[PDB]
Design a protein around this nucleic acid. Sequence first.
DNA 1: TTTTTTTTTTTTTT
Lengths: 589, 181, 159, 602, 208
Amino acid sequence: DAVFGDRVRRFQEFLDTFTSYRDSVRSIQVYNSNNAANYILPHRIIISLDDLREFDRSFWSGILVEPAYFIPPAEKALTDLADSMDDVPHPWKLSFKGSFGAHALSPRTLTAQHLNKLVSVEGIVTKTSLVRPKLIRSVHYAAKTGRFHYRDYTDATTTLTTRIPTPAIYPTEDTEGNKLTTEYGYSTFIDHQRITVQEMPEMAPAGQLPRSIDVILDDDLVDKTKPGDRVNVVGVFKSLGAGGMNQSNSNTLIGFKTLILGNTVYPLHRQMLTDFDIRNINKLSKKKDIFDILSQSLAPSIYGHDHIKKAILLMLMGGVEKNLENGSHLRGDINILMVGDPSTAKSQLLRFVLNTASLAIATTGRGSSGVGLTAAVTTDRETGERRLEAGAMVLADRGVVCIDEFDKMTDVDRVAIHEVMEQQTVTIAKAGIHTTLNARCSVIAAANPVFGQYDVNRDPHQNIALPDSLLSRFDLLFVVTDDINEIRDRSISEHVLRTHRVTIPFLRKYVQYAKERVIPQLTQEAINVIVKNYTDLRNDDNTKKSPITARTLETLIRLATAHAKVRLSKTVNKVDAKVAANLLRFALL
Amino acid sequence: LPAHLQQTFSPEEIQFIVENEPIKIFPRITWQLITTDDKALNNMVAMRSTEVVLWIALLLKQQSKCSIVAPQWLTTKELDRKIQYEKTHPDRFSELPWNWLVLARILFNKAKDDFHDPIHELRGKIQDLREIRQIKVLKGLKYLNESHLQLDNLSLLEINELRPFITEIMDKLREIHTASL
Amino acid sequence: YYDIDDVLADGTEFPCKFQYDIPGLGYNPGRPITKNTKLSLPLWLARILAIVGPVPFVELLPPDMFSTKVMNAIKTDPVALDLHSINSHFFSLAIKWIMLFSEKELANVVSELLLQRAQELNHHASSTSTFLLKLEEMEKEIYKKSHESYKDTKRWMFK
Amino acid sequence: DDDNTEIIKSFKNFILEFRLDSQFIYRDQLRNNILVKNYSLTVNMEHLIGYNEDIYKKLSDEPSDIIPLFETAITQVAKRISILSRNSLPTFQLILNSNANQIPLRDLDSEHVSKIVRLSGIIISTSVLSSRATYLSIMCRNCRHTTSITINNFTVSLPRSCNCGPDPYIIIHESSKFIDQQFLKLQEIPELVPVGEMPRNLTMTCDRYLTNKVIPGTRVTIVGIYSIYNSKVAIRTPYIKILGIQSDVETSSIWNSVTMFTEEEEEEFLQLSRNPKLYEILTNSIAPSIFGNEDIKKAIVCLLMGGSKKILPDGMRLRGDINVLLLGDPGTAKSQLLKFVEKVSPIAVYTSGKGSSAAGLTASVQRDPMTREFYLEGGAMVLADGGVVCIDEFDKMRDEDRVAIHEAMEQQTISIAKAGITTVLNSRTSVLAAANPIYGRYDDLKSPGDNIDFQTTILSRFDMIFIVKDDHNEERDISIANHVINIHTGNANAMQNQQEENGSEISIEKMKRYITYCRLKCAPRLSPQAAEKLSSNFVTIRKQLLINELESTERPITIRQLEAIIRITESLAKLELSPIAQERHVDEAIRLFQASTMDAAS
Amino acid sequence: MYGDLGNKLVLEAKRTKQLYARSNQDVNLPMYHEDIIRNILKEVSNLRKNTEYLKEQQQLGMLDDKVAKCQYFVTLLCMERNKRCLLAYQRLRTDILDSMAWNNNGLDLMSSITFSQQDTNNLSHQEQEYLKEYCDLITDLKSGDLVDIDLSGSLVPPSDVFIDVRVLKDAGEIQTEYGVFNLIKDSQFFVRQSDVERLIQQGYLQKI
DNA sequence: TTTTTTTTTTTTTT
Ligand SMILES: Nc1ncnc2c1ncn2[C@@H]1O[C@H](COP(=O)(O)OP(=O)(O)NP(=O)(O)O)[C@@H](O)[C@H]1O
Ligand SMILES: Nc1ncnc2c1ncn2[C@@H]1O[C@H](COP(=O)(O)OP(=O)(O)NP(=O)(O)O)[C@@H](O)[C@H]1O
């Protein structure tokens, strides 16, 4: 393998020329020892492939083409270099970027030639085969002859190059027959995983279904990504396994299940605000009509319903949280529902909450099993371990669940749905594992009138379609009438017609920032009013309609707090409460 | 306004070009004709080698009062020496009569009877000849740059059929390149 | 000019901020727009807006299609990238920006783009699949004259 | 093998020598396809039988032992064609088709096994791409001897010769070459020969340039070879390896798609647009069977073209094209009509369910009981995406995903959060509702609403809703009753339509290619004022149905109804192949839904 | 919002270039857009209306403001823009029609452009007058030669020399010139290239 | 030289 060293001395020139990589190299080499001065760093480096055409194109192409012959000596080169660095006081890894490609492709298609080559391939993460650590290097200590003894085990999944079947036994008393004890806490174990990726369902060509394919995640790549996330996954596509021709079994056509090793795994759509941007965020934040402004831009086509819009943004903040000490939490995230005659744009309105909201996942009615319930993947998958897997609502943790036809979901689902909102967790007894896992989620749905257009005529009782405690947990019930005004109908027409014929993306960039910086806490000014308001409700709102509870007031907290994040005020203020007093009026009238 | 083609010549036309070239024939016949570009002749000796223009020979062969000679370049054993030269010279296109592809179709259409065993032979040899020559063309096409072109030996049919592609492209090349300054 | 593509080529907006205040807004009620207000503008007007001011009326930030992103994107595997997706008027355009702004490197790159493209484009001389969709308009027409040349040629070749 | 090498020479001969006057078709085809990177050639077995009978007589005898040889020469042929030497050049594929002679599936047993069989059937479901070996090499686990196997087709375990033993070899995975394999599951044609029983499905397998050539659920023709393999007495599984496959007419279509072009189409499609009768002659394409019912008859057309689908940012997108109701008294012809409609669609699924025939009307994800792990099983709506929706018995549809119909028609999607998978998958499918109304004509003296299940909202979900009322009335019958006995024997009305073919009428297998054609060009759109006209028309439709409701009548109208009538405009316009739509153009779409407004008034 | 309106038109010019380009060639230009150019024209007259107004305004309170200096260097550009669009639209619209002239008249005995170029009414009258005036001009090229040409005829090279043409539902005979060949439905011949050229373009003759 | 597997989805049913 003289050429193996040739790839290295070719790339050795690339070491220090250009040296723009050595900065982060050294940086790892420093922040590790700075954590060593504490009182965690991964070893691997992003390399934009873009630069490499500026040295050897002849080396460039093969990096994608036959990485088994190229990437391991340059891999060795990272380690070689970094070892030449200070200071005395590990195999490393790589990623790259792209800057692609041939080799630009989506998971929907692959092979023949596409195999055995570096590729970037993007998409949905499912089903997340769960983590187990893996054996690589063996080590043992002889006595009384002493010394230190070892082996190095190599799976077909490790590295790239084909190698003799190392596995699987401890060397165990190498000659002369001296006892050899496992070196545990010495010998190397890198964690391993296999994660399939489904191509985006909407970009599917035809009635043909989505096809996922697995990608092995070694070292860091594990725990980086949960299921359901959009991820560009890069690495080299291995031809793996016997062709059924290893043995007499089986006499058949089928064979060669295969996946991709390495490499990078970037998430896609967080975010990156620099300075110049957030300066705009705050420049706008100063303006006092901006709440309404942000509300209007939500629905480019849709008419008005600005009170509903506001309500949505109020859910888009999260309305902070407060966790008790040694007691149960006070839910701060906001749960609402839409109701009204068909063609209210309720479903389509949900589809706006599909993209800007930074998750979570929406569902049409069904739904289940238990939605966010894991429903206990069974049996095992794999190696004799019964496993759970992310359910809808779980995947939706700290995100937006949305529902088309929450009225059409089963009565049996509703049980765990109560468990979704008050208890705000997930209880699992099924086989099984008894874990109570956090279900804390922002949840909005829509329901149609139980019977026809009578949504307006009939009392809310019987118009519910989903009694009862379901109604309590809802911060708002929104009745939207299809009722006719020809005066309005002209307006209804023209904007709808100019349809087919204040910026939202920035709205996401702003909302995200308003979450973490900052939480408002509270001031007594809102308190000096909304109390008067609540009792005012109870002594009045019962002479009109129902219901009224303490909970509906707790929403005054959440609502006010939501707009409090909208003002980006470091604290809650009275006028925010006035925004709440606004929203609940139109909630019941 | 010709519209079509327009810069390049139609193969249909270029055949009209080559049809104006001189060749030998074997007359059946023993006024004048006067014509224009003909000169010759007085009543032309029957069953003897004689030089005329192609298209006249085409027409009198259509009356079969003449017989067209196979060009001495066109033969099996000859095509072999040339195509062999072609394989052992990956860059140069060797040497050809230059109106030939047209001549081939032209003669095979009518003059077919005069040759000895052109059938199922030459059409293959020239198909292959045109083949290795065609790949020599296409492979030469990566050196394409402004402003220089050596096509050296290439036939007018060969060339004209591909004319628009190098011409039109090369302009997009040179224009932008000198435009840089 | 009198090829539709010439008036059509300037139909592309380029990022440009003005170096001056411009009373009499070209678009609505400024009426002036303050210096360094970012705007996408058609090349036909913009082209001269640099030539006259000796400081110009307009700053002219680099276009989104000439980004290092795309410029090396083409450098990776020229055949695969879809030119129709980018503008689609590019060689009909990039020529104009490389004239107006007078760059020297990207040229030597771009020419090679068209080269490789044509290396492939000739290979379609013989009588698509996914490819035929993704070509630029001039890249689409070169195909016309080239192909149709052959398309007549073979029909002559036999009867 | 030098015998096989003489056969090799025989095929090299076959290619270089062969002539159709005068170009050598396969020879041209090669250098044509090498720049396509097709690396394959489709050869008529008749030019072969015309070239030398002998080689076929032995080819037809054990083709399996020869077909690769046939390739080993033509892969060499490219060597003497593609380039000159003194890379890497992939081993060729060959695809051979022939007119041949058709054989029915039910009669396929033993006998013809290990030979060529032309036959059609229809594919049910596509297997996932499965890659297979082409070249592989191996070092020994013990002696480190370097072996090189060319894996060829058409099992065969790895050879053990340089303890060393028993078989010490493991694949060099790094250096190996590869190909895809499809594993077609395909079904016999619906018509023959079921006798009494259920349709069989016999499994076949594509590879290389054959893969993904055929959609799930489309009529197709495969030639291939009848063979067997164990696959856990001797009881080995029947199958057919695939060469070559050809689509039944066309089918081409997929993807993006095809023309190609055969120029006469554009002209002939434009002349259609210059024919003032074209809209109406399409109407006369739809029912050679059905004389009359011209209203709904005009209503079918506008759906198939696809209507307005406009995606405007943000992710908001409005559907196309729409929905239609055939509900009316039996005698409507609407099932006969629908059985025209589905055959018209380039790609669609006919559902009388419940869901069709055995289909979960929506895709129902079902665990593979082997190796666990739920996988989505597909669905009628799913497979029918970008195609027609056929529904009978809509009185009886599955109530739970009835809502997934209540949704997929609109949001162009179905969300499955069930089990593991959250993917919201596309049904852009356009529904036509053919169900029979409750009690026939008895809902006419009643409230015509709530006719469909327990809610009126389904109507809103639909668009072009049409109530077909046939009274026993005079002379409109006596002419269609006259039409009848002609229709039956001797097709005295089906001859009368063939002189209208020469005079006027469309061929309707054409109509497929028409609607395939103009659905792939970008979406048509109305000029502003026809829209404002939709505004003053509808302000009075809505005004009228509040005033109609001055009687406190329960009901019907929405704002998706106006928009519904919008999409009909771009439909009827997409007929025209015109980016715009004229005022009156839109107007007969108005008169076209106007009957449904009186369906609201009745 | 400004010089854009013409871009719709030049786009249409693209498509109508495509309607002659392959095409296959039936010509038949869709229409002169009389409405839209006039929209442009009301803005092109509006532009120099604004500019003439500013030419008044520059003289009073603007005082040759460096920005006031701009809009002459600015709006006038859109004047050139429109001009470009309109010009090239019409140079297209004409080059196509002059081509439609050259090919056929058409040919004997043209004997008239009447019913030829079926557009007739649909083609705008300024172009109608122009075109017919232009083939009036081309008749003078029939005057200049004195070949005889038959520029309109004899486009493709001769061969050889005799062909078999079949008549399609055509009578006939108009054959008074030369000699009378008696045109009947389903009538073919064996005849020299010469006489072919006219009734082959006249549509009467067919097979070559 | 062999290893090892019961929920979840849907269904037809009193
Ligand atoms: N501003 C708007 N207001 C109302 N509807 C609109 C508006 N703009 C568009 N629409 C359309 O109105 C329809 C709304 O349907 P929608 O109610 O959201 O679905 P749905 O509720 O699931 N059907 P249903 O369950 O019966 O209520 C869609 O076709 C939208 O495209
Ligand atoms: N133009 C026509 N109009 C009416 N009936 C026709 C026509 N042509 C044929 N028929 C005959 O009448 C029947 C028309 O179908 P029809 O009686 O309406 O049943 P259907 O409603 O389509 N089926 P279903 O959807 O379950 O109600 C056919 O069975 C034909 O025999």
